[PDB]
Amino acid sequence: SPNDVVSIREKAKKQSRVKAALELAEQREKPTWLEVDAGKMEGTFKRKPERSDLSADINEHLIVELYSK
RNA sequence: ACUGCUCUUUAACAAUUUAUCAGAUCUGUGUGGGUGGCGUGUGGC
Structure with missing residues (x-):
């Protein structure tokens, strides 16, 4: 869990x-x-990084639609 | 007095010959480290 x-x-x-x-x-x-x-x-970790602090050449909404179609 | 009358809107470039898709180390203060040569003389055995 974060904050650890x-x-x-x-x-x-x-x-x-x-x-x-x-x-x-x-x-x-x-x-x-x-x-x-x-x-x-x-x-020491506090909280998972939000939309701002990750990679910007990646697809997840597409992966979500592939796993949820 | 008695050599002296416009010339006409500011610097004025060197770079150069296959060729490519670019092609881990950021330390110490543990410590050794912070008078003789020669000569002469004497005496001894």
């Missing part, structure tokens, strides 16, 4: 994998809808 905190286990935050992947997320597009804590190595 998730992280990696407390004994694995010095890894090459974790540091690399977190720096990678830092180098990607930073979500305003997901508070990413690259120092705390975690994510």
Whole structure:
């Protein structure tokens, strides 16, 4: 459920994998809808992004009509 | 007095030869690191 905190286990935050992947997320597009804590190595989510913050080259109404025809 | 009478609406371009569909790293202050050469002399064994 949104408004939740998730992280990696407390004994694995010095890894090459974790540091690399977190720096990678830092180098990607930073979500305003997901508070990413690259120092705390975690994510806190509040609410799913609305019509404004998603991809604009995608079809879902067509998928809805294909699944509902 | 006694060389001196319009000339006519502002700078005035270099770029150049297959060729394409563009084609992860943003760290430390753990620490070693912050007088002799020669000569001469004496004496000893």
